[PDB]
Design a protein around this nucleic acid. Structure first.
Ligand SMILES: [Mg+2]
Ligand SMILES: [Mg+2]
Ligand SMILES: [Mg+2]
Ligand SMILES: [Mg+2]
Ligand SMILES: [Mg+2]
Ligand SMILES: [Mg+2]
Ligand SMILES: [Mg+2]
Ligand SMILES: [Mg+2]
Ligand SMILES: [Mg+2]
Ligand SMILES: [Mg+2]
Ligand SMILES: [Mg+2]
Ligand SMILES: [Mg+2]
Ligand SMILES: [Mg+2]
Ligand SMILES: [Mg+2]
Ligand SMILES: [Mg+2]
Ligand SMILES: [Mg+2]
Ligand SMILES: [Mg+2]
Ligand SMILES: [Mg+2]
Ligand SMILES: [Mg+2]
Ligand SMILES: [Mg+2]
Ligand SMILES: [Mg+2]
Ligand SMILES: [Mg+2]
Ligand SMILES: [Mg+2]
Ligand SMILES: [Mg+2]
Ligand SMILES: [Mg+2]
Ligand SMILES: [Mg+2]
Ligand SMILES: [Mg+2]
Ligand SMILES: [Mg+2]
Ligand SMILES: [Mg+2]
Ligand SMILES: [Mg+2]
Ligand SMILES: [Mg+2]
Ligand SMILES: [Mg+2]
Ligand SMILES: [Mg+2]
Ligand SMILES: [Mg+2]
Ligand SMILES: [Mg+2]
Ligand SMILES: [Mg+2]
Ligand SMILES: [Mg+2]
Ligand SMILES: [Mg+2]
Ligand SMILES: [Mg+2]
Ligand SMILES: [Mg+2]
Ligand SMILES: [Mg+2]
Ligand SMILES: [Mg+2]
Ligand SMILES: [Mg+2]
Ligand SMILES: [Mg+2]
Ligand SMILES: [Mg+2]
Ligand SMILES: [Mg+2]
Ligand SMILES: [Mg+2]
Ligand SMILES: [Mg+2]
Ligand SMILES: [Mg+2]
Ligand SMILES: [Mg+2]
Ligand SMILES: [Mg+2]
Ligand SMILES: [Mg+2]
Ligand SMILES: [Mg+2]
Ligand SMILES: [Mg+2]
Ligand SMILES: [Mg+2]
Ligand SMILES: [Mg+2]
Ligand SMILES: [Mg+2]
Ligand SMILES: [Mg+2]
Ligand SMILES: [Mg+2]
Ligand SMILES: [Mg+2]
Ligand SMILES: [Mg+2]
Ligand SMILES: [Mg+2]
Ligand SMILES: [Mg+2]
Ligand SMILES: [Mg+2]
Ligand SMILES: [Mg+2]
Ligand SMILES: [Mg+2]
Ligand SMILES: [Mg+2]
Ligand SMILES: [Mg+2]
Ligand SMILES: [Mg+2]
Ligand SMILES: [Mg+2]
Ligand SMILES: [Mg+2]
Ligand SMILES: [Mg+2]
Ligand SMILES: [Mg+2]
Ligand SMILES: [Mg+2]
Ligand SMILES: [Mg+2]
Ligand SMILES: [Mg+2]
Ligand SMILES: [Mg+2]
Ligand SMILES: [Mg+2]
Ligand SMILES: [Mg+2]
Ligand SMILES: [Mg+2]
Ligand SMILES: [Mg+2]
Ligand SMILES: [Mg+2]
Ligand SMILES: [Mg+2]
Ligand SMILES: [Mg+2]
Ligand SMILES: [Mg+2]
Ligand SMILES: [Mg+2]
Ligand SMILES: [Mg+2]
Ligand SMILES: [Mg+2]
Ligand SMILES: [Mg+2]
Ligand SMILES: [Mg+2]
Ligand SMILES: [Mg+2]
Ligand SMILES: [Mg+2]
Ligand SMILES: [Mg+2]
Ligand SMILES: [Mg+2]
Ligand SMILES: [Mg+2]
Ligand SMILES: [Mg+2]
Ligand SMILES: [Mg+2]
Ligand SMILES: [Mg+2]
Ligand SMILES: [Mg+2]
Ligand SMILES: [Mg+2]
Ligand SMILES: [Mg+2]
Ligand SMILES: [Mg+2]
Ligand SMILES: [Mg+2]
Ligand SMILES: [Mg+2]
Ligand SMILES: [Mg+2]
Ligand SMILES: [Mg+2]
Ligand SMILES: [Mg+2]
Ligand SMILES: [Mg+2]
Ligand SMILES: [Mg+2]
Ligand SMILES: [Mg+2]
Ligand SMILES: [Mg+2]
Ligand SMILES: [Mg+2]
Ligand SMILES: [Mg+2]
Ligand SMILES: [Mg+2]
Ligand SMILES: [Mg+2]
Ligand SMILES: [Mg+2]
Ligand SMILES: [Mg+2]
Ligand SMILES: [Mg+2]
Ligand SMILES: [Mg+2]
Ligand SMILES: [Mg+2]
Ligand SMILES: [Mg+2]
Ligand SMILES: [Mg+2]
Ligand SMILES: [Mg+2]
Ligand SMILES: [Mg+2]
Ligand SMILES: [Mg+2]
Ligand SMILES: [Mg+2]
Ligand SMILES: [Mg+2]
Ligand SMILES: [Mg+2]
Ligand SMILES: [Mg+2]
Ligand SMILES: [Mg+2]
Ligand SMILES: [Mg+2]
Ligand SMILES: [Mg+2]
Ligand SMILES: [Mg+2]
Ligand SMILES: [Mg+2]
Ligand SMILES: [Mg+2]
Ligand SMILES: [Mg+2]
Ligand SMILES: [Mg+2]
Ligand SMILES: [Mg+2]
Ligand SMILES: [Mg+2]
Ligand SMILES: [Mg+2]
Ligand SMILES: [Mg+2]
Ligand SMILES: [Mg+2]
Ligand SMILES: [Mg+2]
Ligand SMILES: [Mg+2]
Ligand SMILES: [Mg+2]
Ligand SMILES: [Mg+2]
Ligand SMILES: [Mg+2]
Ligand SMILES: [Mg+2]
Ligand SMILES: [Mg+2]
Ligand SMILES: [Mg+2]
Ligand SMILES: [Mg+2]
Ligand SMILES: [Mg+2]
Ligand SMILES: [Mg+2]
Ligand SMILES: [Mg+2]
Ligand SMILES: [Mg+2]
Ligand SMILES: [Mg+2]
Ligand SMILES: [Mg+2]
Ligand SMILES: [Mg+2]
Ligand SMILES: [Mg+2]
Ligand SMILES: [Mg+2]
Ligand SMILES: [Mg+2]
Ligand SMILES: [Mg+2]
Length: 265
RNA sequence: UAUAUAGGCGUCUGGGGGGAACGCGGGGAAGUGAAACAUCUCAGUACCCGUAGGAAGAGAAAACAAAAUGUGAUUCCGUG
RNA sequence: CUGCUGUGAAUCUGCCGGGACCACCCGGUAAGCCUGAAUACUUCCCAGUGACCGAUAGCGGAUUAGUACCGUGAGGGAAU
RNA sequence: AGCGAAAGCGAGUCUGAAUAGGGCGUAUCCACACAAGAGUGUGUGGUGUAGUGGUGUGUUCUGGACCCGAAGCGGAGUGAUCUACCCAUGGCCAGGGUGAAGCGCGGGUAAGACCGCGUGGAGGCCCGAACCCACUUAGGUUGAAGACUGAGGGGAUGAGCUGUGGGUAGGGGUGAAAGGCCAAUCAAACUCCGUGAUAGCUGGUUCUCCCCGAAAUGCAUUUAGGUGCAGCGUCGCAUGUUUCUUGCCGGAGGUAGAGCUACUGGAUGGCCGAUGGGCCCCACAGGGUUACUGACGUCAGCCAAACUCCGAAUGCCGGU
RNA sequence: GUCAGGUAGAGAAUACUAAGGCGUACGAGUGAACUAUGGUUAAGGAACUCGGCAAAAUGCCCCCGUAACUUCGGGAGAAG
RNA sequence: AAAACACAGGUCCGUGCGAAGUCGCAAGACGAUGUAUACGGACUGACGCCUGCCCGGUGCUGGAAGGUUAAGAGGACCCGUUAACUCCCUUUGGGGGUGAAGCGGAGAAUUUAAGCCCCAGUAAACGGCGGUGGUAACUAUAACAUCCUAAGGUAGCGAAAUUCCUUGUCGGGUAAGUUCCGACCUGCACGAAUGGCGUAACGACUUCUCAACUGUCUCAACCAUAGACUCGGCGAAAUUGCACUACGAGUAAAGAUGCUCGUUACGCGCGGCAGGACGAAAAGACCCCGGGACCUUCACUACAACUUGGUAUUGGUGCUCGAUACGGUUUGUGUAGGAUAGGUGGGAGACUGUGAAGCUCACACGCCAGUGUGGGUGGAGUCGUUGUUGAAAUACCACUCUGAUCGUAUUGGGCCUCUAACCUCGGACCGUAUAUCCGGUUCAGGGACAGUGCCUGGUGGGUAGUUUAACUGGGGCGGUUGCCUCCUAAAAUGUAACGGAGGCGCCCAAAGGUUCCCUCAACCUGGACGGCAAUCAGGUGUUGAGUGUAAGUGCACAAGGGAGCUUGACUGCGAGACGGACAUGUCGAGCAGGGACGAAAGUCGGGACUAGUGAUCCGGCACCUCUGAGUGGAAGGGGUGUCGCUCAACGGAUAAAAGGUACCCCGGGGAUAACAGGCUGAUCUUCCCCAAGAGUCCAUAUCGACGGGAUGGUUUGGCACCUCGAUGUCGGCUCGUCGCAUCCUGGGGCUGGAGCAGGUCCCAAGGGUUGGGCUGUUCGCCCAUUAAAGCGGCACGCG
């Protein structure tokens, strides 16, 4: 009487039970074809468990999907440019750049070692013990970088900007990830931890865009993340830059903000 | 409804109810005892029902018995 | 031995019983019926008797006694 | 006449292979022998064996069984004249407010909506007597009354109140549901009967004197405030000092005390001095120096219900 | 269950009355405490107490005028 | 009298109609003279916005391929009895073996329903709704990776009729705010029809506030009436061992009118007060014990009800399959070969023109190697012990297993039917003037079903009877219950407690018997691994090692270590004893049989010893010379050996059993708890001894650490001494009374006392010692005062 998600994770189909739920969610893994009727299934281990046959499953976290979705809309070159990750410590975003042939990447954490052992062996992988959260060091990360990916959680991503515009070059290219129910004053999270309010997302994206513009970093374009938090955390990836023909800083910022939520998700 | 029956009309002869105990045939507890209790007991008791008679019921072997050339319908009493 | 249900024979070199059953022996003759005496009792009547009571006893009732009275009622129930 | 489970045998019998031990039985005593002192046996004689039926007393068994006492259980009946609900057929509800729909008029509306005005008489409507309740409080509390009285209190045309007649009955009825009510009683009414229910529980049990005279412990217990058997009382019979005391004699103990270099543990201070500690010359050889920690040992003083190299007094067993 | 005089009054309420009916079955005394039932109370006014319990207070008619809120009926006899 | 019930509104489930449901044994009735917009049941409870997740558990509903399962059909196989033989062995018998039929007993395979397992749906069904590892804005305000599930609280609300902590925090309100209001979220232990959150109107509901009003109060005074009181009349009651019934300090069953010692008191009444008479009342209702009673449930065991199947009532024809008896085709690879050699008895002689041979196909199989039947053709034969071939015809009559077959006789399983039993609360007509009864007749429908008997399996708190241990410093909760060893245990034996420590419910065919032989542990010295340590050698070493297994007593004489043989880990017994309420239990020399070891002496009836166990009943099994319901057998019983009980509550109430009662009742108990009293005083409380210190120095102005000794009886306790045929339980009110351990007032000594004001100690009990807010409050917090707002005893004084 072994749980179906139990046998699945035992075989090696998915390294974690959260992924076992993702696979049963669309019914990618079942016996005799068909969607897995229910995640509560008593299946004998002598049966056959299938899979979506995802060829590009060389990923070790969920942060991969949201990134590959952003890079679909942006198509940003990585080789030949230094890169910065604002802290994932789980291989969600940096490992994708590894698959992108990144020249050299740097990642942060909360002062904790929990990365995949696979990434503890690549020479171009730098690990730091949360030197600082908001005012990132522009030189101790190895010098100048040419890309920064924003991945923040229970901290309103609006205080690391002075550091991330300094932790860059004069010709910089940045893709921040705006999480809606996390920009509102801490404690004022949306109803039940999930937000169904386009106007709240509008307020959050406007606040982050205006905070970026305060430094001069204008918003170029928008993107809706394809695979969000399971219970609900739909993200909206923007794009920071100070010198392009797409200097949407006066009126086009709002037009692009409507685009973000009108085509989101 | 034809055979007819169910019925209807008339004329007789009975039945009905009571009763203290005793009889016969049925139905049938619980308290109690078992130092608890259910089998078991109490007890086929108490009570109930149907029926009598001066008594009733039983009664003339499809019985006993045990190798005895033995008893011989039933009922009741004493023993065993 | 016996009730309800099912199945269900023979008429005497038959059938029943003799403490599972079988053989032999013995006893008897079911599925029809009547039957006195010896046995149980006393509402009532007669005549007696008591190392029985003697009026708080003996019947509840020696006297208005199943009365007066109590209870809606089944019923309880004096004292003299 | 007994032994045996029995067939059976019989002063024997059972077990057993056993004239080989034991069991039960051969009244009891006496003697004389023949065998062993491992508790005496065996045998020859003798003596010869006591029951039963009336009846008094004590105890006991079956019966209500020394007397009184439950809450309750069963059988058959009686009750809805109180109360619960229902059914038929009747009666009652002073007085005063409010002002629903409906209808009619006007305004307003493409037409409506709607409003203002009237008539109108709705309603588990309002205030409030009769009537029905019973919220507060005081009195009553061997009452006026086994549930009232006074002052206020809620409903008062309604799921209203009420009269007369009727129906539902006990593991049943009825319940706008409180285990409420069902005749001053209800977690199963009442009456009679079973019946003198049963109570390891409480209570009571009536004249005298004479002699003797306890126990409140052990064991078992659906047991722990009950009982059985033992102990301990009395009476009858048998035996006769067997009892008890004191002296002496023969014993076995491990308590008091003590001791511990006699063990097992604890435990005080010294003494020498390791091994393992550090350092020198300089190797991690080797050697010595040093608060070293300081095994073992040793000196002296100690401690113990489950320690004992020892070890009484008493008590106990026997003899005399 | 029926009948329902007068005067105030909306009234079958309440006060007093008519007709009619009663004075209903222990009394007579008496300025004790205390209890009960009524009454009044300077100044203060809930300080009482578990709590404004109980008392006190408002109370009728006619004009004027009425709030938040509302389910548009009400609240409302608001309050004044 | 309520917030509880009801309610209008909501949903869910059942019900197709003499419905379902209910009352009845039935008939019958209500439902309803209703018919799914109706009726019953369940929950919720106008209205408004909504009602999340979980179908794993348990129910409900549905389904069926399998597993399992009753009665009923089946009777293979076995056993009893004995007609017959067949034999001895002795002779007129009598035991051995076989044993047909018949009758009997136990009875297997096989077949068969529901249910259960199984798989689905269902939550406005009964029910459920998580964490961890390390984190940033200025700490936060749980929404980075991973474990687990049936899913991980949705919305809304939230110190709540819900919050112990708690008088949470902040604001309001008061002079003073434990209640209240508005919020906060750390929701011990809210949450979505046991609805969640709001809501106008309503309430003899609960709570907070303001105005007004007042004898509620400061703080009480006065008046009248009914009693009380006096006089006359009548005239009770509960109660009651007494009696010419003081107090104090004691003593006593521990709280005395009655006893002690002292003090006080002339005799008798009337009106008043309630301190005592553990006052009256009611065989304590709290608590324990015994017994009831009613209630609950997956306690036990039953029964109603519901339901399954078989069979009776109960029949007919058609098919489909199965079992029987009977008939005719039809079958057998083999090598020594004219052989696709069914097992045969007869076999010198059977088969043609009723057209066989050889040709045409099918039937039959085919390991397709080859052969039997028909007519269409066909022409007048083929065959044998032929010889090889175990077995010959494969030329013929009668018996025949293997098979592919049809039919008859018989009997089942099923299926579609028919009508004739039976059924209809469908119509009509009649008895019958009257009649929704009833019976009949007849038409129309079902129909061998249903219903009902009997047998049978399920479900079965719907009901019924009952059980649900004891010990216990009250009871409960915990723990324990039998056996063995030690200490307590006081030098015999025995000895209690919920006293102090541990073991047991086995193990070993050798770890049993015998015969013989040996001596360890530790220490020093010498040796490659090899270290203190492993095996070797030398020595010292009397017991410190080891003895299956706890502990104790033992054992070096060895009971300890080693080897040989071997089963005495025997059968018949047992003088005499230990221990003992009894029932149990324990030791035992010696005799005989038959053995083991030993030369023999001798030892051996398990183990160095003391745990390793369960009475009786009832039943099983093997053996025996017992019995055998007329007789012979048998069945059944009996003896002997043995088997089956965490009966572990271990002397074992049943084969079989849990809980609630605050709705409770009875019988008892001060044998036993709660209150008060009594004893004690661990704790509590109040003092003291010593003085390391602190105080700049200076123990002792003032505090005094570490330790030590006491008082009181106010606290929490310990005990269980009186009271359970009744000793009323907190706080406040009224009224006191006593102590002093003094709060104020009065008198002082020392000061680290200049004065003012204090600190500490000593003496002193005459008087005094406030009113409020918060709270049920005591306690306590606060407000305004005051000379001060003392602490205690008196049944935590006083109903
Ligand atoms: Mg008669
Ligand atoms: Mg009985
Ligand atoms: Mg009994
Ligand atoms: Mg009894
Ligand atoms: Mg006669
Ligand atoms: Mg006769
Ligand atoms: Mg006769
Ligand atoms: Mg008399
Ligand atoms: Mg006289
Ligand atoms: Mg009399
Ligand atoms: Mg009368
Ligand atoms: Mg005998
Ligand atoms: Mg024997
Ligand atoms: Mg003898
Ligand atoms: Mg005589
Ligand atoms: Mg005699
Ligand atoms: Mg009765
Ligand atoms: Mg009646
Ligand atoms: Mg009108
Ligand atoms: Mg109108
Ligand atoms: Mg009204
Ligand atoms: Mg009203
Ligand atoms: Mg009114
Ligand atoms: Mg009024
Ligand atoms: Mg009124
Ligand atoms: Mg009432
Ligand atoms: Mg009240
Ligand atoms: Mg009085
Ligand atoms: Mg009076
Ligand atoms: Mg009143
Ligand atoms: Mg009144
Ligand atoms: Mg009426
Ligand atoms: Mg009547
Ligand atoms: Mg009732
Ligand atoms: Mg009566
Ligand atoms: Mg009554
Ligand atoms: Mg009853
Ligand atoms: Mg009863
Ligand atoms: Mg009796
Ligand atoms: Mg009695
Ligand atoms: Mg004497
Ligand atoms: Mg005795
Ligand atoms: Mg005696
Ligand atoms: Mg002597
Ligand atoms: Mg001596
Ligand atoms: Mg000695
Ligand atoms: Mg000793
Ligand atoms: Mg000593
Ligand atoms: Mg020791
Ligand atoms: Mg000692
Ligand atoms: Mg008038
Ligand atoms: Mg009047
Ligand atoms: Mg007059
Ligand atoms: Mg006077
Ligand atoms: Mg007054
Ligand atoms: Mg005044
Ligand atoms: Mg005034
Ligand atoms: Mg006020
Ligand atoms: Mg106050
Ligand atoms: Mg106040
Ligand atoms: Mg006060
Ligand atoms: Mg009042
Ligand atoms: Mg008034
Ligand atoms: Mg107004
Ligand atoms: Mg208002
Ligand atoms: Mg007004
Ligand atoms: Mg009310
Ligand atoms: Mg009341
Ligand atoms: Mg209620
Ligand atoms: Mg409804
Ligand atoms: Mg439901
Ligand atoms: Mg029905
Ligand atoms: Mg429906
Ligand atoms: Mg409700
Ligand atoms: Mg609702
Ligand atoms: Mg729900
Ligand atoms: Mg669910
Ligand atoms: Mg579920
Ligand atoms: Mg389910
Ligand atoms: Mg399911
Ligand atoms: Mg089912
Ligand atoms: Mg059968
Ligand atoms: Mg809260
Ligand atoms: Mg509150
Ligand atoms: Mg709560
Ligand atoms: Mg609080
Ligand atoms: Mg506050
Ligand atoms: Mg609040
Ligand atoms: Mg519910
Ligand atoms: Mg709840
Ligand atoms: Mg719910
Ligand atoms: Mg509600
Ligand atoms: Mg609320
Ligand atoms: Mg409200
Ligand atoms: Mg009301
Ligand atoms: Mg009320
Ligand atoms: Mg005064
Ligand atoms: Mg007077
Ligand atoms: Mg007088
Ligand atoms: Mg005194
Ligand atoms: Mg005293
Ligand atoms: Mg005295
Ligand atoms: Mg005297
Ligand atoms: Mg007096
Ligand atoms: Mg008095
Ligand atoms: Mg008085
Ligand atoms: Mg009393
Ligand atoms: Mg009592
Ligand atoms: Mg009890
Ligand atoms: Mg049938
Ligand atoms: Mg049937
Ligand atoms: Mg049941
Ligand atoms: Mg029951
Ligand atoms: Mg009984
Ligand atoms: Mg008991
Ligand atoms: Mg007990
Ligand atoms: Mg205790
Ligand atoms: Mg105690
Ligand atoms: Mg001793
Ligand atoms: Mg001694
Ligand atoms: Mg003792
Ligand atoms: Mg143990
Ligand atoms: Mg040995
Ligand atoms: Mg041996
Ligand atoms: Mg050696
Ligand atoms: Mg040995
Ligand atoms: Mg043995
Ligand atoms: Mg003996
Ligand atoms: Mg021998
Ligand atoms: Mg021997
Ligand atoms: Mg027995
Ligand atoms: Mg016989
Ligand atoms: Mg015989
Ligand atoms: Mg036998
Ligand atoms: Mg026991
Ligand atoms: Mg026992
Ligand atoms: Mg038993
Ligand atoms: Mg209740
Ligand atoms: Mg009682
Ligand atoms: Mg006592
Ligand atoms: Mg007291
Ligand atoms: Mg006490
Ligand atoms: Mg006392
Ligand atoms: Mg100083
Ligand atoms: Mg005692
Ligand atoms: Mg006493
Ligand atoms: Mg008491
Ligand atoms: Mg008394
Ligand atoms: Mg009293
Ligand atoms: Mg008394
Ligand atoms: Mg006082
Ligand atoms: Mg003093
Ligand atoms: Mg003082
Ligand atoms: Mg002074
Ligand atoms: Mg001074
Ligand atoms: Mg003076
Ligand atoms: Mg308060
Ligand atoms: Mg005082
Ligand atoms: Mg007190
Ligand atoms: Mg006091
Ligand atoms: Mg009191
Ligand atoms: Mg009182």
């Amino acid at each position: 009487r072994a749980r179906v998600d139990a046998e699945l994770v035992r075989r090696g189909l998915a390294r974690s039970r959260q992924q076992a739920a993702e696979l049963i969610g669309a019914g990618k893994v079942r016996i005799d074809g068909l969607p897995a009727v229910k995640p509560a299934t008593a299946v004998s281990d002598t049966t056959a468990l299938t899979v979506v046959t995802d060829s590009e499953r060389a990923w070790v976290s969920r942060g991969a999907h949201k990134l590959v979705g952003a890079l679909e809309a942006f198509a940003i070159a990585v080789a030949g440019r230094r890169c910065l990750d604002a802290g994932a410590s789980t291989g969600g975003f940096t490992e994708v750049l590894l698959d992108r042939g990144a020249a050299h990447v740097v990642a942060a954490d909360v002062g904790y070692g929990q990365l995949a052992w696979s990434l503890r062996n690549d020479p171009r992988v730098v690990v730091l013990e949360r030197t600082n959260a908001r005012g990132l060091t522009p030189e101790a990360i190895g010098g100048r970088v040419d890309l920064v990916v924003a991945d923040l959680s229970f901290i309103s991503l609006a205080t690391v900007l002075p550091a991330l515009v300094g932790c860059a070059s004069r010709d910089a290219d940045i893709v921040p990830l705006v999480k809606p129910q996390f920009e509102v004053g801490k404690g004022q999270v949306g109803p039940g931890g999930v937000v169904h309010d386009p106007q709240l997302r509008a307020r959050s994206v406007l606040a982050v865009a205006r905070r970026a513009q305060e430094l001069g970093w204008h918003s170029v374009g928008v993107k809706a993340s394809p695979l969000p938090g399971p219970s609900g955390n739909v993200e909206y990836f923007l794009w920071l830059r100070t010198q392009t023909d797409r200097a949407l800083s006066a009126k086009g910022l709002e037009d692009a903000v409507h685009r973000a939520i009108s085509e989101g998700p």
